[PDB]
Each structure stands twice: as structure tokens, then as C-alpha cells.
Amino acid sequence: SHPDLNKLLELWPHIQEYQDLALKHGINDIFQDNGGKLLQVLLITGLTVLPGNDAVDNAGQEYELKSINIDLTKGFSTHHHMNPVIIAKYRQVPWIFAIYRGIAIEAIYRLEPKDLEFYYDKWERKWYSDGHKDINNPKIPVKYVMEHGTKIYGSGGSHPDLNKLLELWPHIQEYQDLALKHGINDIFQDNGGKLLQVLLITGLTVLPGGNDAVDNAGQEYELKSINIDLTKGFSTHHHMNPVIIAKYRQVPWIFAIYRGIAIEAIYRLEPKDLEFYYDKWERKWYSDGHKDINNPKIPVKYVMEHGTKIYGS
């Protein structure tokens, strides 16, 4: 019947084991904030993640941890509001840089505070050059980290759970391939592993970015989601206005409710069911002097009261 959904179900228990392992190690969601990726790093390095600094080893030393997906960028980001209070903090600890390729760890580099000074100087000298102005997310090149860092290998310092991660790895690999077959680049970012569940359940195909998804018949949709244990309102648009609304009003919306890494429920609302929001938002736009609205929310209770449940109990 549905071979891709069958595959998910058959891979699921191991996704759940991987989630369990991430939780044990201080990572709340594998399918969000590089959760499934950070776990590899923590297990290889022997590090304890901090919920100030990002991690601590068993000797009590603390670290800054930065990471990139080489498939997308070559610069490690830093701090959006770069100041000398930030910089003096930075000079106190070694840094761990992680280089992922897709969902896989490709390299880990350690830099001591002296190997980074070149950036602390050019950052605080140009803070003053421009007079008391905070820098916006300045980059440290991967090339620089590779040149001055000491690369870290799996070793005697790695956590015993590294072998449990290794045993799970092949199923995670295949799950990621499944996501990619369905247009999701990374199961461990942007709720990728959850979204895949939504697409397999609904039969929706994502639209490369227009609207978010399309069914077999050619009908298109806006597709929104929340982690219900974290929030009770669905996001819409950071620059809400009449133009965004005229696009929205032409399609049904799909609303996915995740709890943990699992899909709890899916609802569908037709354009007529959202007219209350379009109207609310247009008047607000005008009332404020033709001013864009910053991500106004649709409450899950509204969605549950007016929508049709396509999945859940």
C-alpha cells in the first residue's frame, strides 16, 4: 500500500532509541537545533553539554561550541550583538568547532584561547574604530579553524554510549534518506524528522521555496506546526500584511502538532475557517498605520475547535 510509511514504522523504534540516548545526554529534541548532530559530538569528545558556556569535560574545564554544515556554509557564526563583555568571556575558554556534512559529523577541532586572539583583536579594535557599536554575527572561517586547531578523533576519551550510537546509526542514515526522498534536507534541523511523519501521513509533497505543499490532485496548502509542550500558538509571518493575506486566503491550511519527536495530531482548516484571522490582521495592519505585524499567532484551541482532524486521538 504505502511503502514509505511502512519504512518509517519499521525504522521508528530505533529513532526512538536515538531520541532516548540524546535525552540521557541532555539534548531535548533530536529533530531540532542540530540535536541528532550534537549528540555525535558529545559522544566522541566525552563532553557534557551545558543548558554561560556550552559544554564541560569531566575535569571541569568549560568550552564554547560552534558548528556548521559544510554543505551550506564555510563560516562559524558567533554572536549577533558582539561586545567586549562577550569577547572577554570568549578569551577565557577553549572552543570546539564541529563540521557536519548533512547529518554526519565530518571533523572536530579544538582551539585554545591563543589560537582565536586574532579574531578577538580585529573584533574589539573595530568595535572602537566604529565607536561603541556591537558587531552583527561576525564569521570565523572553517579554513582558519582547520589551520590553527587540533583535530579531534574518536578515542579513549569518547563516551561508552558512542557504540550504541554506532549501532543505531544505519537506521538514522536510512531515515534521513527517506526525508530527502520527500524534500526535507536535514532530519535534525527545522523539525525535519517530524515533518517527514506529517508528509507520509497526509500524502503531501513539499514545494521548493509560493505555498508550502501540494497534494496529488494539485491542491496547494500552507503548512504550520508547533511543539505543543513548548507552545500553544501557530506561527504565521514575521512581516504580516494585506499582501501575505491575499496569498493565504486562497488555500487551506494544514496544522501539525508535535509532542516530543512524534506527531500528536494533524488538522485542516479551509479559507472560510481563517477569515476571522485575515480580517483581524488586516484591520490591525491599518489601525497601526499600514504597519506590518510580527508573527501574529493562531491558537491551537481555535484550530482544534474549527478544523477537521485528519490525524490524532
Place this chain on the structure above:
Amino acid sequence: SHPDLNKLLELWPHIQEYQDLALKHGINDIFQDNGGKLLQVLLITGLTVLPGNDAVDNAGQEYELKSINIDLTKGFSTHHHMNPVIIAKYRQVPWIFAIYRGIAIEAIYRLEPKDLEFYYDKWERKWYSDGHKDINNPKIPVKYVMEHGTKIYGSGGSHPDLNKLLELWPHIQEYQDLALKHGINDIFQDNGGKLLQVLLITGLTVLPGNDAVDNAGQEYELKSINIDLTKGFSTHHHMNPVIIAKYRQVPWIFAIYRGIAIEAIYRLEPKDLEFYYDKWERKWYSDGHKDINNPKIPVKYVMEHGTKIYG
């Protein structure tokens, strides 16, 4: 979209809790031997299943517990090989009769030692006269239990767990409806609950000759085992060269169960089973034209030569 498989996925956490609930009450498998049914009678009556007497209450009285499905029969099966020695055990305990309709308990009756005296003594007369022979599966009628029995209702004597049961019931009902739609009569019998997972995964539907059919009209034999219990799939209790000739025409689907969940599905084509067909078909002739009593297909043969459909 596959809306029936989706339905099972949404129902599953509840099916699991039901199963968890039954194992807490001494029931290993809700989907075999009326487990999901008996769970209702234990919770209604406040009874606990015993590991020769069937059940016990918190006050010590020990009971014999029989049951039937009204949809299919009117008689309460008793014992295949009963003697007049048995009847003295049968006689020191009130019996508890459960009458189910489909998956739901319809009525519960408690008859006392005094009320079965008509039947023991009819079978004790049966043994003597016919010539010291065993009465195969006698049947107490429902009308006899209804008439002489004391009906049991939900009450203060019911297990507090009955509340959890009632909250899970809507889901069990909906799961049962899904079964029915796919040609399975009873989730709580013959691995009914598991077979459905099989059908929704394979895209098969049970046939009212061959066991199942897909959308294209193609038909299949379908065998299953509970791996903790058996290692070889079964075939036919009276296998004859004509049964084999039907076997040869269709692919087989083999389901491996582990508890209430489907662990693996394998498909074999007619050529992968030729070795067995040929061996049984000849053996029949050799032994002297006599039917073969359920020869087995090893699970390892299926894993070695089949194509895995789910695992």
C-alpha cells in the same frame, strides 16, 4: 495517503495500553484466546485468574470460568475427555459464565454448585450406559444458564481498573470496526488484532480457498506464527494433492508475531515452495494414499528464501 493505516497508527498507543492493562491482570495476549474479552469479565467481576480452578476473588472463593460468543453459538463447550472423577472437582465450585457478542461482554451469570447438578449427573449417566466412554465436548445451553443463573452487573465489587478499560473502549471499538472492514471478524480471537497490522502493511484484505487478495485481484495464502511459541508455519491438517495444487497457484505471505506486534512479513513465490509441495505430494503416495496432518514450513526456510516486505 493511506487512511486505514493512518487510523491504526492513531489508535495504536491505546491498543498498547489495553494490552498493558491485560498483562497486569494475568492476560498475556489480548489478540489471542479472547484475551481482550476476558479482561472485561475480570474487571467487571473483581476476579483474578488462577495460573485446576479458573479464578479467585479477594475473599478466597475459587471458580470455574466458561464463555461463548453469542454471534456464533448457543452452547457452552464443557470438556473433550471428561470422566466421572472430574465432576467432584467441577462440583465444589460456583461456575461463572460469560456471554460475549463480538468483542463485548453481553451478560455474566454465576451458577452455584446446586444449579449444575442436572448436568453432571446427566454426563455421569452418559459414561455408565454407553460403555465406559468419554463424552466429547458436551454443551450446556445458554437458556439453561440464563434461566438458573444469577446475573452479575458492574458494581462496587468491580476492579478500579474497569475505569481505565471504559476510557480505552472507544478506541478498541474503532479498531474492531477497522478489522471488520478488512475481513477480520474478531480482534480478540485468532491473532485478529495482529493480522490487521499485516493487511494494512501488505495492502491485503481477507477473503470470506485462498486466504487474501490485493487490489489487482491477485490472491495469496497467508500464514503467521507467534515466534515465542512456534518456529514453523502451519499448512493443512488434512493435506491432499489437490490442496497442494491450489497452493502452487499463489504466492504466500508469512507473518511473524512478537507479542501483539508484527515483527516481520516475508513473501515467497510458488517456486520457493516447490521443494515442499513436491515432498508432501510424493509422501502422500508413498505412505499409501494418506492425508498429511499439517506439515510445517520452518521460519528459517522462509527467511532464507523469501523477500522481506516488512521488518
Place this chain on the structure above:
Amino acid sequence: SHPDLNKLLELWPHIQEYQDLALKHGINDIFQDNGGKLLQVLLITGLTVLPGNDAVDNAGQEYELKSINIDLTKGFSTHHHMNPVIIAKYRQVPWIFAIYRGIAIEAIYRLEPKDLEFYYDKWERKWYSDGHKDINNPKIPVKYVMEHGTKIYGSGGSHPDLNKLLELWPHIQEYQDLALKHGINDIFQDNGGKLLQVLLITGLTVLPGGNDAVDNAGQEYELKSINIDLTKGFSTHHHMNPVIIAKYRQVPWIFAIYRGIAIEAIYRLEPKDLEFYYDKWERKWYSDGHKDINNPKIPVKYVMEHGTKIYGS
């Protein structure tokens, strides 16, 4: 404060893991019916236990399984009601004999139906010699099994869970030592691993067999237990009479309620709280013509209604 109770708590999670592993493998209670011992055997041999025959291998062959604790006996028991319907059953399958030393597996022997024929013959020839009489639990000597059997070693046929059992083994070992320090010979027979919990909780010392246990002050007790999920009545005595009652009536009774391998609750009833039973049982003895009663029960509900809870919620 209480170092032996502290030890239990510290060993417990692993007793629970061992229990989990036994359950996964078809053994309901590690602390009963050689549960923790049978598990070793199943894992070494690669066998699936049957709830007819005792076990099955992955090829479908079935077996009879017998076992002894060498510390106690040298004969494998068989069938209390030995008949030719029993014997012809026996001739159909190989037998696995297990030889334990305490809680540890010491040897495993396999015998084919021809290696046992000597016993099938001397059993059915003496069935008839005595005319249609069923034999009572005839013995096969360990010496005979060792001579004609083929000894089984850990091998490529063993279950992967054997290594998980090995990892747990040292904590099971120490738990057994703890039981022995408290007068319990075997944690895997006669609810030994549960009883140890009761003794650590109550501070009771068992009395070698008089009464069952004694406290520090010198007060003695009858000590009864049940697995509540299996039964609702406490056992008393297989040959109940006025003599057994006069002994009982002089001490308080301790009543342990196990659920699974854990202690759910402990109650205490004074002699005055059991007088209803003594009286009930004496009259019954006389009423029946001075006839011993076969294990009459005290209901757990009675115990809960009239006793003092020393442990539980």
C-alpha cells in the same frame, strides 16, 4: 544506618534489568521456579522456553529440560505419575539437563532419545512387573547424564543477550551473597530475592528449620507471603490441626505481599487478630471427624482490614 538495605538499593536497578531480560525471554519471575537460573541456560543454548515440551530451538526441534542444584542432589527428577503415555512422549525428543551450583550454571548436557532408552525400558518393564502402577518421580543419576551426554559450551549458538547477562552477573552475584548473609540459600528459588527485601525492611532474622523468624528483642513470628497478582489467599499448613494452631496462636504473623519481584506491602497481625481463623479451623477439624485440613487460606483482604501496615502505600 542500615548498610545491608543500602546495598540492596544500590544493586536493585540491575536486579530489575535482569528481571526485564528474563521476561523478554519468557520467564515470568526470576526469584521463583529457578527463573534466574533457567535464563542462563536459555541464553547459552539459544533455546526458546515453552510455556507439552519444555523448549524449542530455532530449527523447530523440541526438548525436555531438567535441572538440579548439585549442592543439594545428584538425581534428575522426572514425572510423579510415570505412565507409558508419559514415556512414549519422552522417547520422541532430546533432553537438556542443567547442573547448577547455587545460582550459577555449572554444566549443560544433551542426550538423544537413544541415550535415555535404558531408563525408558526399566521404567515400562517395572510398570508392568507391578501391574498398571504409575511410578513416583523416578531419578536419572547425574553420573549417568555426564557419562552418556554431550556437554554444551557457550558458543556461536548462544543468544546475543548472553553478554548482557554477563554484564549483569556480578551484581546478581553480590545480591545472592547478601541473601546468604541473611539465611536465604537461593535468590532464584522460593521467592528468595523477594524475602531478602522483607527481612531487610523488617529487621527480621530467619530461624533455621519452630517459628519462621525472630526480631532483635527475641520476639518470634510466623512469616507468610503471596504474589498478589497470582493469588489472594495466604497459605498456612498442608496438615492443619489443633496442634499446629497451639503453636501459631503464641506469635504474631508477618504477611508479605509481592507484586512481580518487588515487595508491595508488609502487614502484621497479633494473635488476637487471627483467633477468628484458629477457631474456624479447630471447629472444622472436629466437624470433619478429627481430620487435618489441607492448606486453609487467610484472605489478603482480611489481613489488610485487621492488620497493621509496616510497609506499603
Place this chain on the structure above:
Amino acid sequence: SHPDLNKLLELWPHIQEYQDLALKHGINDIFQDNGGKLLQVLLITGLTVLPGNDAVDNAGQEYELKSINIDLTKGFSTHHHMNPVIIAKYRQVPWIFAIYRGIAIEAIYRLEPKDLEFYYDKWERKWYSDGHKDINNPKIPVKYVMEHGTKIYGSGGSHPDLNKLLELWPHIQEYQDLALKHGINDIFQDNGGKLLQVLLITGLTVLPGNDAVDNAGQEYELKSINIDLTKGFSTHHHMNPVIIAKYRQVPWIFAIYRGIAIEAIYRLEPKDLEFYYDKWERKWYSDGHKDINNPKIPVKYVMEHGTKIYG
């Protein structure tokens, strides 16, 4: 017999469910930062904790959430380094005040944006006049919240989970009483709930100078860490040669926590810590007669040189 440790063992499965219940509601540790308390206010109010606004309801309104323990104080701590820029965030949201007494919620009040205007503007006047300086931890009085606030009661707006909470409460109460008896004021603060497991295992009782004492009169320092958070035990925020001289006289007990459960207990004698005493005591003199701000004892030092009491 050890009747207090027994009591903890009987209570434990319930303490665990409570903790399971709090983590389901976004609370990581019931025994730290009033977790077991906040759980009550979230369930009472139907609120969900947010990962700058403290909480949200199912309808989207977002709130700021403050609280106090009436037993210890009358003022609602506000912010250590508040500016007049903050106050614009502070001003678009109704606040929710929780007043606890010991471990129980005594009253909940909801003040609206309009009702805090007296205080923002008093602090906005505080910043200007004194000379552009930060007001450390101002305090809104309880009388001010009681008087101008709208009290919140259990209702239809409460989480269905509140029912589970109420059924666990008798056990949490009894556990709290056990804590109190052993010198711990609050199970839901400062690892209160975990420290008790420590005391019952070691046979120690908290002192009203030294941290704890056994039956013999012997006293101990007692340090603990949550291993997922810290790897070095702490000492004294203003360590002086006289603090060290008290340290030298007693053995130390070191507790390693993992979630709500005690993972290990180690004891060190005064000779195993000499190395640290000597190094801090000198360092003090070297640096120029200045107090040491909480030097740490590594967990590995404790495991290498201590005697393990529980693990």
C-alpha cells in the same frame, strides 16, 4: 529496622510519578528551583511554561510569573539589573503571582498591565534621580498584589492533570514531613528532595558552622553536585584561613546527584583534603590577604581519594 529509610522506599514510586508529571509540564527537577511548587501553579492556572515572557495560555496570552514563600519573606523579588527599557516588555503583559507556604501554593493573583503602573514608574524615577544606576532586586509587597490583584482559584481552566497531582499530594506531603524531621526545610528547594535520600543512607541529620551530624555526635561538611550541570563541588564564597581551620576538623560527605536520584556518596577524611586546605590558605596570603571566591573540589579528586559509601 530503619523505619525512616523504609518510609522513603514506600514513598518513592510516587515521588517519581510527581517528577514524571513535572517533566511532562516543562519542569526538569521538582527538587530544585521550586519545581514541585510551580507544577501546582501551572496545573491550577492551565498555564504552559515558555522556554522573555514566562508563560502562555492556550488562547495565546503570554505572562510574567513571579513567586515567594510566605514563611520566609513578604517581598516579590523583581530584577537585579533592571533598566527603563525593560519596563516596556514588563508592561505589555499581565503578571501572575504565586504565594507558597512551605511546599504548598497558598494563593495565586493575576494583575493586569494597568495595575503595575505604580511600580514601573517608581523605578523609572529611581533610575533617573540617583544617577543612571541600576536598582538591585526591588520588591513588590504581597499586600500590594493581594490588594490590587485578581485571585485565581482551581476551575474549568485548570489542566486535567491537576487530578493526578491531588492524588499524589498525600505522598509528597508525607515526604516533606520526613524531610522536616531530618532538618531539611523544603523538598522543592535546594535539592531538598535529594539531600534527604543522602541523610537516610548516611544516617546523618542536618544541623540548624558544620553541615551535618551522625548519632555519635560526629559532624561533617556535606557538599553535593548535579553531575549533568557541574563537575566540581563548591566550598565558600568568602573563604578565609579561619574557614579552612573549621574545614580541617571534620570529615566531608560528597553527594553526586543525577536527576532526582542520588547516584553516589563518597567520604573524605581531613587528610585527603589537606592538599586543598594548604593551597587555598597560602593563596590567600600570596594574593594579598584576600578571600577566595568559592574554589572547587573536582569530582575526580573525590572519586580518586574518597571512600564510596553508596553507588
